[PDB]
Structure 1
Amino acid sequence: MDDCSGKTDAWTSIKGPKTGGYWLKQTTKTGENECTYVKGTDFKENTKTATYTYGYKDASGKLTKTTGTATAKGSDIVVGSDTSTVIYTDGKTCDVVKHGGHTELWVHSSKTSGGYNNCCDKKFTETRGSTPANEVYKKCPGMP
């Protein structure tokens, strides 16, 4: 599917629709933290950087919060020591990225119940291949 190919721009991915945030829906990693999320704010076109707040649900059921910076480097999203490479993004509803050998499907907070771009499911399935997927978004609080 032509429009599912070549959608690898990290800056577009970081920004999304510039409101809400993204939840990690599925990952090839086992033991991932439930309700892992990221949320970009204060998008700077000059530098292709954004403030990035991220975390996950702690033992008591509240979201953790750490704030740093996301920097676009071509296909790559860099936050601190961590780099993720964009496999597919629509800049609106979802992304597929690779981080540290793992394949991840991220979904915008507006689309947690489904109805995001099919290219995300296609590219997630393709990229993970035979590595099983693990669900991460379960009984999550709303997006900070």
Structure 2
Amino acid sequence: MDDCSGKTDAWTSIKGPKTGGYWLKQTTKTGENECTYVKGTDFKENTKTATYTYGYKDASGKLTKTTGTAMAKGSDIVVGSDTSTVIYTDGKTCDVVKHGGHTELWVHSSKTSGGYNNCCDKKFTETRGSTPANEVYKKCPGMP
């Protein structure tokens, strides 16, 4: 089955499986920071808010770690002045989001080797249109 439509809940995407974290696998953005990631903690179901720790590979190959508060607002994930809009999430293995004109495919740390929900592949292709995808997960340290 291809249960790929209407799976646009931001809170489901913020939480994921509430363990591990997510790596940015592919993006339409060129010059993206390698090993971009998000890990969620401090999950509050009743306010659909969590802490994000997020970052990417620094000059020494180590990850930056910036914290912020992620709020679910319908299909939008809001971190202060930035927003990502969920196109597809399974809350388990992967997400497709629209982030500042760019299309992003995020994959949970358990599925880095493959086998995440193929709705993500479909919806990523649909969303990005003619803009090529770029690989982001290259020579990465561990998830914080």
- Asked if Structure 1 and Structure 2 have the same fold, meaning a TM-score greater than 0.5 normalized by the shorter chain, the answer is yes
In 2, the alpha carbon distance for the partners of 1:81 and 1:111 equals 30
| Matched-pair contact (CA < 8 Å) for 2:48–2:71 | yes
In 2, the alpha carbon distance for the partners of 1:17 and 1:34 equals 24
Moved over 2 A (4+): none
1:121 aligns to what SS in structure 2?
Answer: helix
1:138 aligns to what SS in structure 2?
Answer: coil
**Structure 2: runs of 5+ lacking an equivalent:** none
| Matched-pair contact (CA < 8 Å) for 2:98–2:104 | yes
In 1, the alpha carbon distance for the partners of 2:10 and 2:117 equals 17
Percent of aligned pairs with the same amino acid? 99
- What count of residue pairs does the alignment treat as equivalent? 144
| Matched-pair contact (CA < 8 Å) for 2:34–2:137 | yes
Q: Over residues 109-133 of structure 1, what are the superposed CA-to-partner deviations in whole Å (9 max), with x where a residue is unaligned?
A: 0000100000000000110011000
Scaled by the length of structure 1, the TM-score of the pair is: 0.98
Q: Over residues 70-100 of structure 1, what are the superposed CA-to-partner deviations in whole Å (9 max), with x where a residue is unaligned?
A: 0000000011211000000000000000011
In 2, the alpha carbon distance for the partners of 1:92 and 1:141 equals 21
CA RMSD of aligned residues (A): 0.8
Post-superposition offset of 1:46:
1.1
In 2, the alpha carbon distance for the partners of 1:18 and 1:46 equals 15
Scaled by the length of structure 2, the TM-score of the pair is: 0.98
Equivalence for 1:134: 134
Q: Over residues 26-70 of structure 1, what are the superposed CA-to-partner deviations in whole Å (9 max), with x where a residue is unaligned?
A: 000000000000000011011100011000000110000011110
**Structure 1: runs of 5+ lacking an equivalent:** none
